[PDB]
C-alpha cells in the first residue's frame, strides 16, 4: 500500500491514506455516498495492511455508526467488501453490508 495515497470509490468516497508505518494503515474517510448519512464529514481510518490483503474501519460518530472494509490491492485498483454496524434509532445494533471498488487518484 503506497503511503501517503489517495483513492475514491464509485459511489463517490474518499479515501485518504496518510502512512501505513508497520503495516497499520491510519488516514481519513469522507463519505459522499448516495443514500448514506454523515456527507462530508472527514472521519479517521484505522486497519492493516499486509502482503495478503488489507481491512480499515471508520467510525462515524455523528451517525452511531462504524464500518469495516476488508480487500486487496491490485495495482491502483482496490476491490472490497464492506460491513457497516449502526445502533438505531431505538438503541437495537444491526448491519447492513456491501461492496466498494476504490481507485487510486494519486
Ligand atoms: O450512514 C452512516 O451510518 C454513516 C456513513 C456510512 C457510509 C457507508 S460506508 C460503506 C459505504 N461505502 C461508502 O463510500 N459509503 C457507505
Redesign the pocket.
Known sequence: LPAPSYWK?????ELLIWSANSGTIQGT?T???Q?????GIPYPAAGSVSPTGLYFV?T?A??????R?VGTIKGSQMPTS?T?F?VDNKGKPSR?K?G?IFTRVW
Open positions: 470509490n464509485e459511489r463517490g468516497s474517510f463519505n459522499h455516498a443514500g448514506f448519512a454523515c456527507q471508520v462515524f455523528q451517525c452511531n455508526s462504524f464500518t472494509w464492506w457497516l449502526y447492513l456491501g466498494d
